[PDB]
Amino acid sequence: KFTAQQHVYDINGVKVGGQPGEYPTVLIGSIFYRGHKIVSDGQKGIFDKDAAKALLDQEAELSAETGNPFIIDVLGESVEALTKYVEFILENTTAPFLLDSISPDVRVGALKNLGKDPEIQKRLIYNSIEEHYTEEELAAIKEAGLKTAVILAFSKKALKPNARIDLLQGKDDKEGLIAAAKRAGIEQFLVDPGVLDVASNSWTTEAINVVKEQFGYPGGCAPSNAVYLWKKMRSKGTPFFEVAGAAVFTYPITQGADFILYGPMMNAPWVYRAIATTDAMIAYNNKLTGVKMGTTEHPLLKIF
Amino acid sequence: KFTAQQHVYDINGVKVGGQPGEYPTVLIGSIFYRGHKIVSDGQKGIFDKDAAKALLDQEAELSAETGNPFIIDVLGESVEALTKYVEFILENTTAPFLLDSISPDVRVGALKNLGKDPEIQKRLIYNSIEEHYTEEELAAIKEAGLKTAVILAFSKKALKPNARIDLLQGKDDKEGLIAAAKRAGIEQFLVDPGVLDVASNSWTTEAINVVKEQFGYPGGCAPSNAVYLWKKMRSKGTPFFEVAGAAVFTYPITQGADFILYGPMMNAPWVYRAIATTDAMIAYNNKLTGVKMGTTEHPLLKIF
Ligand SMILES: CN1c2c(O)nc(N)nc2NC[C@@H]1CNc1ccc(C(=O)N[C@@H](CCC(=O)O)C(=O)O)cc1
Ligand code: NA
Ligand code: NA
């Protein structure tokens, strides 16, 4: 149990945050990521609408089966592409989504196109306010009227978990990431301490623990970051890659994390089954602890 | 990190126990279990020795790959069979092994057949000292001069973790299982709180935690039966069954457990890959917990 009262955000019906076992893990699958075979032109955003819809429908079905809610990680390499991807996602699912790009300018340009749309304020989560945030980024976020952001509380200057306190709150003459986000009008903060490689997932989970223990923000991470590039394991094929991936993806949940970016959506069928199992066992512990489940739509009550 | 000074046993070269990240998880696969198809006659103990040897060779190869040590769970349904299986295991692997039957009469009979033998004393772990123990059984153990036993707190009269601790440590007019084992001359206790079902694997793990917190004995469990009786998930096939399995099997390790009985040895190729991944992440945490690795034969140093 965490000492700070936990923030539980309701993002278009998706509950994120809470004490361990209160709410199911929110699963965040990537679409239109680099090399995604349903994209034929990543600059113009030419993509397979039927295939994308099938992924979204599959996500909805797996979510209905296990009780794990979902937020879509929408990636783009160009303003044109990401704008089109977001338009498609708004139309073809109800889920919140991350506005995501390796390049901040792509996120900024996409926000200008999408505009201060009330639906965008409700369902678009800015991914992310990072160490090297710019003023034009904060201006774009404010002009779009966004209310929820991922705070990527990661730096090579703050490798230790306790150093996330410094990143979020600020230190010396440096504005904290929470302060920066608030200046941009953000009111809900999903804290992601970042993942470098598979092993370092344990440090990321410790950071999540610090953040929940001291501030009560929802904490999560992207364990997929080094898993898909782990060729030694992936080249082994099924089911070796999936069980290795399952070990990585479930680990933060076992230490009280609230959300996981599990990588390409095509992996959802095995990811949901692994994560739901972990959630079930954690929630069963509530019987001893006295923690009450926030919802009846929980893996514990669904997967057996 | 656990409160009590941890007992680390050296079971004929296999280290088991310690603080999280100190030693790799010990993996314990079952051979000659009920319905194991390499067995042509379970009453007489007639089996395909080449197929059995192939399993043992595979275990050694997987162990060499990840750094996870292995102890073989040797099951038998008759005194005749189990005696032959133990003789085979002694000459076809160097590893320690569990003398295992659901029938106490079978364990005791086999053990009597094995006599007083330094190799048996070094390699044979009695599975298990459990609630139905008899003075005959304790005397047979003492006569064999065994030094290590699995202490199994599986009981439908002890569901909650604290009730399992009561079974282990004694309460009221019961000496408890640890005390019973000591009377049999056991000096090393591999504590297995039992797995009642998949969801209650978290209670199993809580019991392991209390054992390590208060006594410092190595703790582990055997979730394979619970996983194989999970019809809903098993019906989904591969790789869904395996990733669910992996979530269950790795969960206790994420909470500091020392060993897992992972079920049939045929499942070793995926179990080792999942467990090694968890071990790698936990050992990476060692700086944060103030733990030192007790060996360089550790997944963190092998699987990347
Ligand atoms: C960087 N990381 C990340 C993070 O750590 N935190 C936030 N908030 N957001 C994000 N967004 C993107 C990413 C998480 N999602 C991912 C992570 C990794 C992959 C991935 O490895 N894709 C593969 C290609 C796909 C494949 O091989 O199947 C690659 O080589 O790039 C795909 C998506
Ligand atoms: Na949760
Ligand atoms: Na094997």
Author numbering:
A (entry chain A), B (entry chain B): 3 to 306
What does the paper say about this structure?
Herein, we present X‐ray structures of THF‐ and THF‐CH3‐bound MtgA that allow us atomic insights into the reaction trajectory of this catalyst. In contrast to substrate‐bound MtgA, the entire cofactor is defined in the MtgA:THF‐CH3 complex depicting extensive coordination within the amino acid environment in a rigid manner. The overall binding motif of the pterin ring remains similar to the substrate‐bound structure. However, the THF benzoate moiety is now involved in a π‐stacking network including Tyr230, Phe243, Phe251, and Trp272 on one side, as well as Tyr35 and His38 on the other. While the functional groups of the THF tail engage water‐coupled hydrogen bonding interactions with adjacent residues, the terminal γ‐carboxylate forms salt bridges with Arg236 that coordinate the cofactor in an extended conformation. Besides this fixation, the superposition of both ligand structures illustrates a rotation of the pterin moiety during the reaction of approximately 35°. In contrast, the benzoate group of THF‐CH3 displaces the carboxamide side chain of Asn227 by 2 Å (red double arrow). As planar sp2 hybridization would be expected in this position of the final product THF‐CH3, the X‐ray structure must depict a trapped protonated reaction intermediate. Notably, the active site lacks residues to deprotonate the (THF‐CH3)+ intermediate; this decreases the conjugated electron system within the pterin ring system. On the other hand, the WT MtgA:THF‐CH3 structure illustrates an intermediate that forms immediately after CH3 transfer from Cbl‐CH3 to THF.
